[PDB]
Design a protein around this nucleic acid. Structure first.
Ligand SMILES: Nc1ncnc2c1ncn2[C@@H]1O[C@H](C[C@@H](N)CC[C@H](N)C(=O)O)[C@@H](O)[C@H]1O
Ligand SMILES: Nc1ncnc2c1ncn2[C@@H]1O[C@H](C[C@@H](N)CC[C@H](N)C(=O)O)[C@@H](O)[C@H]1O
Lengths: 249, 249
DNA sequence: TTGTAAACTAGCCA
DNA sequence: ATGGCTAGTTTACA
DNA sequence: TTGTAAACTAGCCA
DNA sequence: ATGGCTAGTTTACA
């Protein structure tokens, strides 16, 4: 693996003390949602107050590892987002709530509620002096859309010439099983949304921590974009896929 | 004023006793977000624990008006949604977190966070037997998309033939000032999303309560779909606009 | 054009 | 306090 | 084709 | 403690 890519097949809650405090620039956290998925383990088989008690345990181990300029993105479901975000507001300050629109809805067969098509991403910061660089994540227009948005009043603006803010709603399809990026992990996140978080909230060459890296999407996003990565995954098969993914760029 | 459609220029919190308990099928609440808007009053000038205390007060008066099959939609901002939704889960059951993608982002000039393009709507129910009808709110395909979505496995299914679930993310654009639906209210909500709430969670002939009706968007929806309405608005100017919007049907 | 899986069925009845 | 019936659920990748 | 407003700037300094 | 000044922010209505 490259220099700052550290892939650890260890339980994060047992091996976090090994990680030095105030040593991480960004935490990309995609922990189990509490939704009953199979990760080769029972991490997602926890529910209710037991899941919320576990979430706080790992968070109180990860927050100290954050530099005074560090930030943190946390994925969760709406079923536990209000409580998770309420706790993290007493430990950090919330900069954004990012809604990942997965375009493809969750299946099941219900007709008594609207279908799940969104995950909740909480953007928190340690202090008001958090590192945020928008320019590498600006989305530039194409020729046609730039012509449709340009006015004499807007001419010369950075949103029109360089690119606009991704906003707090990111419409990106989930990865199909046959998608080129897809690997053998049940909850693989698109590289597009993870790379955006690293390029905007981790200073170039800084260290990013994925307490639960799964298949190493945050590692790939840190290999390219030149950022340092520390990742923990209990599953060995997942840790393997992670290496292969970082050993193919 | 049509029958069943009831408009009041009063404070909801003081006139709550006038509303019989367990008499309302659906509460469509668009309360002040706590963002500093000017409705001719200072109701949106409350903040922090002052706003959440007032939110929990009106919610404690509005909840016992829901009959056992009742439901409630409440708009808010991500800055207070975790706290608001955490309190309501202690009183009611959360069925859904609907994200309104307003398509058009909020303005200001920031480059230190992602821009706001979404409001949070909470779908809470009093009990597990809440009324919910999806057929009136199913979105039928057009000739081109149904051709792209149709497979022999899906042929005959309600979603492909009748229409799909609108999902928990609603991409409806905010109303431009020059839009023909736009009236002189600072935060008018599109009738498309209010009618969806009324058609899915209120039976025809049922009663809808809007404690902060504003320009009367819910009054217009209840009138056009055969639902009874009760609304409150401290601003007489907005109350007037609410009258014209209903009487123009 | 088409097969097919993707973080988030549920209400009855027994 | 608990299963197992049912009708039932979208999009976009290859 | 073009003007224009829409629930959610932010740090600095005289 | 307080404006004011700055560089700065998108779509889709008409
Ligand atoms: N204590 C733990 N330490 C490290 N990893 C864990 C722990 N508990 C669960 N995990 C793993 O955390 C992962 C959570 C996943 N949602 C990560 C997905 C990852 N972002 C991906 O794109 O593949 C699962 O694969 C679990 O096996
Ligand atoms: N105690 C109160 N009682 C009744 N109305 C109030 C109260 N406080 C604030 N309001 C009004 O509630 C409204 C909140 C608005 N978001 C309503 C918008 C409304 N949904 C519309 O589509 O026009 C404002 O117009 C307030 O003037």
């Amino acid at each position: 693996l490259p220099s700052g890519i550290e892939l650890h097949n260890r339980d994060f809650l047992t091996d976090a003390a090994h990680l030095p405090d105030a040593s991480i620039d960004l935490i990309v956290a995609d922990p189990p949602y509490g939704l009953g998925k199979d990760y080769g383990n029972d991490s997602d088989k926890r529910s209710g107050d037991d899941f919320l008690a576990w979430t706080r345990e790992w968070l109180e181990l990860a927050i100290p590892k954050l530099k005074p300029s560090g930030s943190m993105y946390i994925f969760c479901t709406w079923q536990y987002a209000p409580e998770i975000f309420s706790f993290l507001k007493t430990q950090l300050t919330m900069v954004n709530e990012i809604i990942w629109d997965r375009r493809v809805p969750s299946m099941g067969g219900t007709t008594r509620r609207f279908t799940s098509v969104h995950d909740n991403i909480g953007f928190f910061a340690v202090s008001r002096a958090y590192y945020f660089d928008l320019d590498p994540v600006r989305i530039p227009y194409d020729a046609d859309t730039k012509k449709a948005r340009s006015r004499k009043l807007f001419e010369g603006s950075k949103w029109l010439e360089m690119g606009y803010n991704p906003k707090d709603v990111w419409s990106v399809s989930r990865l199909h099983r046959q998608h080129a990026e897809r690997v053998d992990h049940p909850t693989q996140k698109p590289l597009e949304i993870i790379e955006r978080m690293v390029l905007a909230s981790c200073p170039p060459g800084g260290r990013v921590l994925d307490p639960f890296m799964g298949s190493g999407t945050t590692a790939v996003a840190c290999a390219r974009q030149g950022r340092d990565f520390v990742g923990y995954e209990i599953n060995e098969s997942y840790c393997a896929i992670a290496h292969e993914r970082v050993n193919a760029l």
